[PDB]
């Protein structure tokens with residue numbers, strides 16, 4: 001017999017940088033609601049950004065990657081691979097990743113698209129770290145990108161003010177100390193219909209002049225699942241990384257709803273002075289992009305500092321969750 | 331001052347089994363279209379089309395069941411599932427949690443990976459990487475495809491190529507290393523070579539225009555695969571510390587027989603190396619093609635468990651992913 005060779009990579013892996021792209025167009029509650037107080041009270045959202053018509057999930061991802069590279073002090077030549085996590089790449093094929101790689105001037109590098117609803121970022125982060133420690137790569141881009149605005153039913157009074165557009169990217173590479181803890185993840189396939197495209201594209205393709213697909217949300221069900229189950233997920237993620245709740249400096253949950261996230265902060269028993277991501281206020285829910293965008297906002301404003309111990313929790317569609325403890329990038 | 335735990339799982343990981351699902355309905359060249367014309371160009375004689383109530387997700391579930399059974403394991407033994415596909419026709423929810431739920435392991439981690447036909451290679455790599463990192467001990471990786479609804483029956487360039495099916499592998503700890511290092515890359519400059527021609531949203535906003543279909547720039551894909559994947563193969567063998575002459579089984583993506591015939595020669599394998607030819611009765615099932623081709627070779631007994639196999643996935647995005655594995659089941 002011949003033994004199949006095993007390779008090895010870096011032991012200590014971390015977030016070198018974050019780079020964010022936010023579309024120019026600002027849509028206020030008052031503009032979209034044709035009550036600002038009503039929306040803000042229920043969601044925590046005041047405004048959100050909508051991408052232009054010529055912008056796409058891939059194009060915003062590219063801009064975000066450019067910015068992440070600059071913040072890590074790297075060129076595209078330094079990158080070994082790129083994972084795009086998104087739910088709004090509106091082509092079955094080709095994937096976004098190779099297009100992103102090409103736009104960045106690194107056309108040959110490995111990459112794929114990963115879809116796990118709002119939790120794809122934690123999954124892609126975990127995969128990158130695993131890949132780098134495995135020896136399959138040394139430095140990687142992970143980019144959450146989302147163009148949700150064309151998917152919104154503007155007569156759906158349950159969700160139309162929730163979803164928004166944007167992209168943010170992290171660079172994952174070797175660090176002097178461990179910077180990304182073990183990935184804690186799971187799902188609940190039994191509640192798959194809680195967040196969905198209501199009509200599959202093929203059913204629609206065969207009757208284009210009938211009702212078209214839009215995003216649908218069973219809000220109460222999602223609220224209850226997130227608010228009550230994600231505490232245990234955070235604890236698992238902290239326990240795996242060997243850290244206590246009181247050691248957490250920064251909490252970055254998925255920016256789905258402020259009320260959900262306030263309940264999680266309380267459930268997680270964090271320090272009274274722990275810094276909690278609240279990017280949703282002017283960014284809305286940008287799904288796969290929300291955590292890294294929220295990371296960027298905290299670093300941009302000086303609320304968080306690079307090296308801060310952060311707990312990230314992603315939750316959402318499919319009913320999927322992914323969580324991990326990290327050190328803040330940049 | 332605050333340590334983030336450094337961990338690890340099993341260093342030696344491998345394929346414990348493969349399970350295949352193929353739809354009942356056999357469509358012949360004669361039914362679809364000239365038998366000799368298609369066969370000369372592609373090596374396809376027949377292909378399988380899934381029923382209307384079948385999906386990529388449902389077929390993935392069935393492929394997983396069989397894989398589990400072939401490994402002598404149940405859903406309880408699995409820590410996660412990766413579904414790779416290009417024909418999950420929902421933006422959300424992802425297929426993976428639905429497959430987990432249908433297996434009776436609704437709580438397990440999982441996600442959808444899309445990378446054209448190279449998705450299996452990437453997902454295999456990712457699954458092994460995850461296990462060695464300690465994030466899981468045993469995983470399912472399933473390639474699945476319902477390609478028939480995407481075919482334009484008037485596209486005389488490709489209508490006879492694509493078909494339906496699913497196959498899954500169980501990935502877990504093995505006594506000896508069973509999955510070589512991932513060799514992967516892409517060429518985004520040739521993104522339009524294999525594509526959905528009209529994006530779903532553009533189509534939704536103009537229902538009076540044409541509907542989307544799979545489009546293929548054959549020549550451009552042929553050239554790229556036939557002359558570039560040889561080197562990819564060599565890089566994957568080199569990474570696994572194996573010579574071409576040690577390869578028992580070669581499993582390229584079942585895109586086209588003629589491409590694959592040129593690849594076999596370029597790769598300089600043993601005259602008696604076994605070459606996957608599942609395309610003949612399965613057609614091109616994209617992401618499902620490689621595990622399906624593995625299962626076909628094991629079923630006929632052309633390949634045996636333990637055999638040293640070279641896998642090369644190539645296709646859309648212009649993406650490729652390759653590794654050397656030991657044959658499972």
Ligand SMILES: *C(=O)OCCCCCCCCCC
Nearest residue numbers: 118197213214215316317421
């Ligand atoms: C996080 O859980 O958010 C999920 C949002 C993804 C919705 C995808 C859009 C589906 C509708 C397509 C018209």
Ligand SMILES: *C(=O)OCCCCCCCCCC
Nearest residue numbers: 092447526543544616645646
């Ligand atoms: C392997 O390279 O396969 C790529 C083919 C995937 C085709 C997806 C279908 C796109 C058309 C949707 C109507």
